[PDB]
RNA sequence: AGGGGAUCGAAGAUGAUCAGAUACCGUCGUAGUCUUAACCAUAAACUAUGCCGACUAGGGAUCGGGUGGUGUUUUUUUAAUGACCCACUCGGCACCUUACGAGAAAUCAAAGUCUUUGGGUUCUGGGGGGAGUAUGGUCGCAAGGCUGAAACUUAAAGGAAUUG
């Protein structure tokens, strides 16, 4: 089988963790660059790391990959995290409170705009 | 305790649970100690000042920790009609 | 060097905690044995027995040794530790770390007319592990520790001079017999007594007063 | 609950509980004033008849026995006494 | 030791259950302890329906079904790729597959 | 006591009711929850939001009483509270735990994810039992957001809310952050509305 | 052997010992 | 009630129950039945004397392979034949 | 059937105190239950308690402080001689400094400490600590 | 002991299997199976858990009765009933979660409130074999039931879980 071990996989993931604005989707460029950024005691392992790095780059090009967080996607994912609407979904668009909830409103000694709609079994 | 002439003995007089008046043993890891802050006329918490509540691990294990603190906190002036004696 | 990693361990080096009863008062868990060594340097350790346990395997039995060690100074503190290892020396050494981590205080009392220096237990206490039940009854002056040699020297290391004992079940199980006695002595502080009926101001935990000496 | 006023249960709780299991047991039945058509002749019936109670003068029907509460006649006015 | 709480069966307050015979080996087994399975199948096949349609007057007739309630004993069920054996914690589950 | 400015303002009851925080569970009820108010038809039990607010303030006082902000821990495994806890830790020290809990984060002092909090805040006690279970081993108080059918074992002061809906979960996290900031004094004005939008603590599915 | 058939074996033995003893009285 | 009666007038039931139940005790049964007096060839005495009748080479049980060198003795006071051991290395030569 | 109403009174108190309950209801409130309870409250073991007068036998609602460890009845009520109180005090009391063996005597119901002062004994009812 | 006697079927007869097969498989097939009058008095007759009483954690379902709800549908749109829905309740068959507690453990809402040892009461056990055997009684037509040893022999039998 062609299942790749943790040494091939962890090293490939670590390179992507910090070298995204770097080596592209091409294996030939990948293997010519991985040996320059990281030292590997053998050529066979260095080819497997570059081959898996190429494979993992393609999966990044189509959506994110679970467990992979490089510089560019973490800043983009956090950039949309402050997105807020303008409709203010909690603000009133007209509130509808049932009969039992209406009893709660006056019990607390508070006056709110209510539109009571009855609900029955 | 103490001997015939003062001279307190029986080191380490232990704490007692607020909700059950039960000793919190040195090996009771479920027991907790709640510190709730105080406010002075501004809504700003005073550092270093707390109302302290100690609950044994027995009540916490039985699910009655939350209810017991409602009774404990209401009768100390820092809570309100959430708790009622008549159930 | 120790370089502990624990909020409680940091307070010991900073010196903010000087008595182990301050740990006992707030029920603070102890996860580093150097805390006990720093707070209680006067405790002594001893091994009751070593017994071999064997695991049946495809090729022969796998023999390992069970070490039962009792620690504690002769004034008010004992800890009991049990550990298995493939070597006897390693089990004994590892059985002392466990023993120190489980140090508990014993509540000593008088059989009556409290002249001074509590010589016995305050109340009747009992502890059951497995089938073994160990009962401890306060005894008058000079009666010694009326117990089996295994149970006796555990009570000798607890700072109790006079006590009566009754045992039940398969007491020849040495491990369970000492675990049943360790429960009984630990229960001396769980028994509420009329002289402890007074109210206390519920002192603040030391982890709050000395928060500056925490990890951050 | 570990604390509660066992001396003053709410009337809602005492309403739900069995009659023997209240703080002080009491019957949940009552007596009615039956308006038999025709003559006034006010008759008192129990909540649970166990018998076909009839008026003294015109003894046709006032109530029918049942496993629980008695069932009054089709045409009849009543008020709890 | 007691393997099961119900111990084999569904008898709690019955005393006696008036057994039924196994459909595979004629073994007597109490009806509650039996392993009843219901067999509801079409009259012919999933393959003969293609040929029994055009060769039939009354087009699209009914495709009727057969109904049969089968009882198995403890031995006959295990041997027939049925309730065979489970683990100690899986034994407690009573939900059908 | 209180300066009587902490009562439920008319705008606070707007947000609570518009987010349906008052809609509790069905007829399935726990005897440890007297917060039920006037059970609605169709089986829904309406939660007394007046009790929710006062309990919420009590929780906030405890959080502000802790000497170090980083000693608070917010844990949410539910997908509806994963965003809420993170931004709760954005405006407060409150070291967050979003996602898995890694059994042994409170014991096992040699683990990588070891934490020593003086208080734990959880969203759902049922789904966060692993966090609650270990807190019972190291003498750690726990603050939870308990619905009307949520378990209450080893749970200190709890905020009765509607954990079923995404609007109710995020709002309570939004509210709790606002009061703890006010108690600490970061929000100088009690009557100030904290213009930071309440939908900040609101999950998005895409 | 099975306890059932030890019960059966002994009963047959008691039959004969009840019969050989009848030859005398 | 945990079995046994507790009533303050139940002394007879407890006393009779204990008396009946003691017959399950081997020592109580042996002592009262007088098994020592009617069996156990001694007359309930510590020692007894007799006459050697034969020299025996009783073979030991398992696991053990030896010859025990016992003797056969007929008791003077009773007349019962019993087997006795001659314990030591080479003491069977003195009991011919 | 109900043999002794004091055992059910004391067992309910024990089961209430084990759970940490501040109160417990006792039925059907005999006299010796009150006398036994009054001794417990005199030494501060229970606190306040309330008698509910229904017309059949009465009920008692006892307020329970957390100080009580065990209350129990001794059945049967053995006759206790004056010199045998030290035996009963020894067997079923935790220590010589606290605990009371409550016994009924011709001079009312009282603990063994009061019985020693009055130098009178009788039948044993129970114990409290 | 009469009736009945289809079916299945101790025994028996047969075919087969087998080294043997007086067994399992096959075919027959008597007693029996069914019933009436009278015996027998046993069972893993089991929940392997005596009965009465009190208290102690949560949850849903179900069976019987009762209560309440302008609740839904059928009559006579319409009332009462009937059947459903919601809430409560008394009693029953059980079930799910947990372990305050118990247990050697398996497990247990009782097998809990038992060295902090006492609510009332009945019955039974005291290492394994010999042995539920002998003998004597008593009951049965018989088979057998109930009661029930001793001589002798032995250092272990046994329970629950663990790893192979
Ligand atoms: Mg013994
Ligand atoms: Mg088996
Ligand atoms: Mg009497
Ligand atoms: Mg041998
Ligand atoms: Mg029998
Ligand atoms: Mg039967
Ligand atoms: Mg029911
Ligand atoms: Mg019903
Ligand atoms: Mg039933
Ligand atoms: Mg014996
Ligand atoms: Mg025996
Ligand atoms: Mg076995």
Author numbering:
A (entry chain AR): 2 to 95, 100 to 126
B (entry chain AV): 1 to 87
C (entry chain AC): 34 to 249
D (entry chain Ab): 2 to 82
E (entry chain Aa): 2 to 98
F (entry chain AA): 2 to 207
G (entry chain Bm): 1 to 25
H (entry chain AX): 2 to 97
Text from the published report:
Ribosome-associated quality control facilitates the degradation of incomplete translation products and requires dissociation of the stalled ribosomes. A central event is therefore the splitting of collided ribosomes by the ribosome quality control trigger complex, RQT, by an unknown mechanism. The RQT complex of yeast is composed of the ATP-dependent Ski2-like RNA helicase Slh1 (Rqt2), the ubiquitin-binding CUE domain containing protein Cue3 (Rqt3) and the zinc-finger containing protein Rqt4. We propose that the Ski2-like helicase 1 (Slh1) subunit of RQT applies a pulling force on the mRNA, causing destabilizing conformational changes of the small ribosomal subunit, ultimately resulting in subunit dissociation.
